[PDB]
DNA sequence: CTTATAGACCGATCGATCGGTCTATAAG
DNA sequence: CTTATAGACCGATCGATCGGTCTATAAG
């Protein structure tokens, strides 16, 4: 119970202040539990974070496969999946924290691999929208794992590095991007 | 000159470990000075950082001034800018610290302003490269703003979210993107 | 039942690490029990430790009682007592923890004698051996008390402080001491 | 200075309560300094301890260096060394903390080596007395290596495990001991 | 009731850590 | 005065540790 309360409050703060910047005490205060409790359930702050990450990944893989139904075309998917990046409440929100985290804990194998994993998931969602988009005669794409990578990483810059502007502004800026991108693909 | 030495080692550590991970103690150990001297020549770690961003962003602009000469067309600029912003050892190599720093001290719009100004200098390079082509038939985009931002964050996403790869590798990915992005532009 | 298994891991840990060094959660984990069950069968880490002490001292006394049967003379006894405090697995292996534990609690009258007589039982054995060795002409210790303490302590040092060499190596050391000591009476 | 105060106080405390039992908070309190300062002067609590140990062995090495002149025969030095061993305020008085510390850190090699080297110095001192005594014909020992370790650990027990007798009554036991030991070292 | 067994939860506090300040220098 | 260099020291915390307690279960 208090565990979940902690997982919840931790996410909120991490998204809002980042990893390092977010303090154990605050988590516990808001969570209304105890440091002793937080550390009872997660060997450490790092673990508290990776945990939240998994919980987040799944909470999304789930939202995508369930939300992409309404999309008919393999193109509509690209348009949507990118739009979600901004409207979602899972994984993307705490992207900054993820950088901040990977940045320093990049020399500890336990953490690294554990994160590239989530990374690739999103890299893949693209590999699919693109591949099956190929054969379904929507575009012929030479290298797909590259275009899928570009697309994944570029959409990421747009999401994390555009925070200052508005939701309905971001949602719109993203759409425009999707468009322009859904072209360099068309012919050769 | 220790101020130079110091600025120097501090750039390494910020690039290598990020903001919160770089400590004043390390900085004085590698620069071989003292807390006194470090704090004499600099007010706060914060202002140490900000000085560097600015001193860096400038050396970048100097680079670009010299590099864009060896280019004839705007489309040619794009590819070059984007590739440069991957090979340059100025400002981009600090994208990490810049993000964690922003995310934490974004609170008081004291650091908020300062950062935007720096990041807006980049959105501007694009606005030039873009409006310059809209007057050279290079292409046509009724909204150079939105596209200067898209291009800006996107390319940044490409640069920061890929530390994995080999530079030669990155360069190719970048160029692929340049082409793709450019493509989907002037065609009503 | 579990109380017994728990006493087991607890004893092992207290010997391997110190008293402070040994955590309850560790005890819980290695015995696969739980906090609840641990703090039900035992009142406190402190008491858990002491109970282990009394039991162990007990089984040692027992071991000595049997084991010495094979020692005709007091001289043979001495050598055996010493070699035994080296090979035994009761009580002596807990020396460290006893020390650490008292150094942080001899400040109370509770733990004071509560473990002070647990050891005088060792200066005792030496007293018997030396004494009964006097009324046997094996030697003429005109001060069993001193010599009895001296031996008990010298042996505790040799046992406690040389924990690095191998067991048979320690025994060689221990027997050499045994001979020198008797040899000097 | 405030560094020295810390060293002084941390010894008494360790001697009195043992390693794990002496808190950094208590040391700073009495030293009238701060945790910040203490952990600026010594990387860690353990390190503080070894530091103390170093000062201790050598302060001891001095006391002996000086006292071993009041003796004309190695037989003499043996009695002295053992007496000095339990009157000195150096090293020996914190055997408890050492024992404790040694077992708890038995696995960390850094510590192990350091700790052993320290102990060996005491064993060597005996080895010297014995070897000299040999060449001087005061006795004949075929295995001074062993008798040294024995003499050292034996004398150690008498010293650490008799904390309740009156010092002058203790130099009495020890002396009886030295007589026995030395005596049992010759043919009969 | 009693006996056991889990296990979530915490008060108290421990050993670090990290910006940064203050006093001492020295020399133009 | 100024610039510049050193370094002992600490305030404010921070993440984790560790005995130990309280509720929940179950079976006799």
> Which two three-digit tokens encode residue A18?
């980042």
Phi then psi for residue D165, to 5 deg, are: -90, 165
DSSP class of B89:
-
The distance from CA A132 to its chain's CA centroid, rounded to whole angstroms, is 22
Claim to verify: residue C135 and residue C69 sit in the same structural domain: yes
**Which chain A residues touch B118 with a CB distance below 8 Å?**
none
Please enumerate in sequence order all residues whose Cβ is within 8 A of that of A131, keeping only pairs 6 or more positions apart, or say none.
Answer: A144
Please enumerate in sequence order all residues whose Cβ is within 8 A of that of C51, keeping only pairs 6 or more positions apart, or say none.
Answer: C7, C42
CATH of the domain at C87: 1.10.357.10
Measured distance CA(D153)–CA(D159) in Å, rounded: 10
Measured distance CA(A16)–CA(A27) in Å, rounded: 12
Claim to verify: residue A1 and residue A73 sit in the same structural domain: no
Query: Do residues D144 and D131 make contact, with C-beta atoms less than 8 angstroms apart?
Result: yes
CA of D34 to C1' of F22 (A): 38
C104 three-state secondary structure: coil
Residue in this structure with the two tokens 């534990």, named with its chain if needed: C101
Contacts 24+ apart (CB under 8 A), B107-110: none
Question: How many residue contacts between C and D have a Cβ separation below 8 Å?
Answer: 119
Measured distance CA(C50)–CA(A183) in Å, rounded: 79
> Which two three-digit tokens encode residue C1?
């039942």
Q: Does A contact B via 3+ CB–CB distances below 8 Å?
A: yes
> Which two three-digit tokens encode residue A178?
């999707």
CA dihedral C10, C12, C17, C23 (to 10 degrees): -20
Q: How many CB atoms lie within 10 A of CB B12?
A: 15
CA of B37 to C1' of F2 (A): 15
Contact between B157 and A160 using a beta-carbon 8 Å cutoff: yes
Does D113 contact chain C (CB < 8 Å)?
no
Measured distance CA(B170)–CA(B157) in Å, rounded: 12
Measured distance CA(D127)–CA(D121) in Å, rounded: 10
Claim to verify: residue C5 and residue C42 sit in the same structural domain: yes
Asked if residue D3 keeps its beta carbon closer than 7 A to nucleic acid strand F, the reply is yes
Task: Report the candidate in D116, D117, D147 with the shortest Cα–Cα distance to residue D129.
Answer: D147
Instruction: Give A50-119 as a DSSP string.
Output: HHHHHHHHHHHHHHHHHHGGG--SHHHHHHHHHHHHHH--SSSTTHHHHHHHHHHGGG-HHHHHHHHHHH
Task: Report the candidate in C120, C123, C117, C182 with the shortest Cα–Cα distance to residue C152.
Answer: C123
Rama region for B33: left / alpha / beta (φ>0; ψ in -120 to 50; rest): beta
Does C164 contact chain D (CB < 8 Å)?
yes
Please enumerate in sequence order all residues whose Cβ is within 8 A of that of B181, keeping only pairs 6 or more positions apart, or say none.
Answer: A180, A181, A184, B78, B151, B154
> Which two three-digit tokens encode residue A133?
């988009």
CATH of the domain at A6: 1.10.10.60
- When CB atoms are compared, the residue of C104, C154, C157 closest to D18 is C104
Sign of the torsion formed by the C-alpha atoms of C34, C40, C41 and C45:
positive
Claim to verify: residue A162 and residue A133 sit in the same structural domain: yes
The distance from CA B41 to its chain's CA centroid, rounded to whole angstroms, is 25
Measured distance CA(C111)–CA(C50) in Å, rounded: 9
Task: Report the candidate in C30, C27, C22 with the shortest Cα–Cα distance to residue C101.
Answer: C22
Please enumerate in sequence order all residues whose Cβ is within 8 A of that of D27, keeping only pairs 6 or more positions apart, or say none.
Answer: D6, D9, D10, D13, D38
In this complex, the residue with its CA at the shortest distance from the C1' of nucleotide E14 is D23
CA of C57 to C1' of F27 (A): 36
Query: Do residues C129 and C78 make contact, with C-beta atoms less than 8 angstroms apart?
Result: yes
Q: Which chains does chain C touch, 3 or more C-beta pairs < 8 A? A: D
> Which two three-digit tokens encode residue D27?
């040391």
**Which chain B residues touch A176 with a CB distance below 8 Å?**
143, 146-147, 150
Please enumerate in sequence order all residues whose Cβ is within 8 A of that of B1, keeping only pairs 6 or more positions apart, or say none.
Answer: none
C115 three-state secondary structure: coil
The CA distances from residue D140 to C175, D130, D181, in Å, are: 19, 9, 13
> Which two three-digit tokens encode residue C79?
């050598």
Distance, first Cα to last Cα, chain A: 56
Claim to verify: residue A95 and residue A134 sit in the same structural domain: yes
Please enumerate in sequence order all residues whose Cβ is within 8 A of that of B179, keeping only pairs 6 or more positions apart, or say none.
Answer: A184, B79
Claim to verify: residue A2 and residue A85 sit in the same structural domain: no
- When CB atoms are compared, the residue of A20, A154, A185 closest to B154 is A154
Does C150 contact chain D (CB < 8 Å)?
yes
Claim to verify: residue A45 and residue A60 sit in the same structural domain: no
Task: Report the candidate in D29, D33, D34 with the shortest Cα–Cα distance to residue D13.
Answer: D29
Instruction: Give C25-79 as a DSSP string.
Output: HHHHHHHT--HHHHHHH-S-HHHHHHHHHHHHHHHHHHHHHHHGGG--SHHHHHH
Q: How was this one solved? A: X-ray
Measured distance CA(D83)–CA(D178) in Å, rounded: 9
Claim to verify: residue D181 and residue D155 sit in the same structural domain: yes
What residues make up the domain containing A105? Answer: 50-186
Phi then psi for residue A187, to 5 deg, are: -95, -170
- Which 3-state string (H, E, C) describes chain D? CHHHHHHHHHHHHHHHHCCCCCCHHHHHHHHCCCHHHHHHHCCCHHHHHHHHHHHHHHHHHHHHHHHCCCCCCHHHHHHHHHHHCCCCCCCHHHHHHHHHHHHHCCCCHHHHHHHHHHHHHHHHHHHHHHHHHHHCCCCCCCCHHHHHHHHHHHHHHHHHCCCCCCHHHHHHHHHHHHHHHHHCCCCC
> Which two three-digit tokens encode residue D50?
């070894």
Measured distance CA(B151)–CA(C162) in Å, rounded: 72
Give the residue from chain C lying closest to D119, CA to CA.
C161
Measured distance CA(A7)–CA(A9) in Å, rounded: 6
Residue ending a domain, among D14, D34, D49, is D49
Does D187 contact chain C (CB < 8 Å)?
no
Query: Do residues A103 and B96 make contact, with C-beta atoms less than 8 angstroms apart?
Result: yes
Task: Report the candidate in A79, A112, A80, A82 with the shortest Cα–Cα distance to residue A98.
Answer: A112
Claim to verify: residue D54 and residue D110 sit in the same structural domain: yes
Measured distance CA(A26)–CA(A16) in Å, rounded: 12
Claim to verify: residue D165 and residue D127 sit in the same structural domain: yes
Does C143 contact chain D (CB < 8 Å)?
yes
Q: What angle do CA D163, D26, D118 make, to 5 degrees?
A: 55
- When CB atoms are compared, the residue of D143, D157, D176 closest to C158 is D157
What does this entry list as its resolution, in Å? 2.9
Where on strand E do bases come within 7 A of a protein Cβ? 4-24
Query: Do residues B59 and B51 make contact, with C-beta atoms less than 8 angstroms apart?
Result: no
Claim to verify: residue B74 and residue B141 sit in the same structural domain: yes
Contact between C180 and D153 using a beta-carbon 8 Å cutoff: no
DSSP class of A142:
S
Q: How far is C178 from chain D (nearest CA, A)?
A: 10
Into how many domains does chain C fold?
A: 2
The distance from CA A158 to its chain's CA centroid, rounded to whole angstroms, is 12
**Which chain D residues touch C164 with a CB distance below 8 Å?**
116
Sign of the torsion formed by the C-alpha atoms of A75, A81, A86 and A88:
positive
Query: Do residues D52 and D10 make contact, with C-beta atoms less than 8 angstroms apart?
Result: yes
Query: Do residues A70 and B69 make contact, with C-beta atoms less than 8 angstroms apart?
Result: no
The CA distances from residue C169 to C52, D100, D103, in Å, are: 29, 23, 20
The CA distances from residue C168 to C79, C87, C171, C178, D168, in Å, are: 14, 9, 5, 15, 37
Claim to verify: residue C32 and residue C111 sit in the same structural domain: no
In this complex, the residue with its CA at the shortest distance from the C1' of nucleotide E12 is A36
């Amino acid at each position: 119970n208090l565990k979940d309360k902690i997982l919840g409050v931790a996410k909120e703060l991490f998204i809002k202040n980042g990893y390092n910047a977010t303090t154990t005490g605050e988590i516990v205060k808001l969570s209304e539990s105890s440091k002793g409790n937080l550390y009872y359930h997660f060997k450490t702050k790092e673990n508290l974070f990776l945990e939240i990450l998994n919980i987040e990944e799944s909470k999304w893989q789930e939202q995508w496969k369930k939300e992409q139904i309404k999309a008919k075309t393999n193109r509509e998917k690209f348009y949507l999946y990118n739009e979600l990046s901004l409207t979602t409440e899972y994984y993307y929100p705490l992207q900054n924290a993820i950088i901040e985290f990977y940045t320093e804990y990049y020399k500890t194998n336990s953490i690294n691999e554990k994160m590239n994993k989530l990374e690739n998931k999103y890299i893949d969602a693209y590999h699919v929208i693109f591949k099956e988009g190929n054969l379904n005669g929507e575009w012929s794409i030479n290298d797909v794992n590259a275009v899928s990578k570009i697309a994944a990483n570029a959409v990421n810059g747009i999401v994390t590095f555009t925070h200052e502007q508005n939701i309905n502004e971001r949602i719109k800026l993203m759409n425009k991007f999707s468009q322009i991108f859904l072209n360099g693909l068309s012919k050769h």
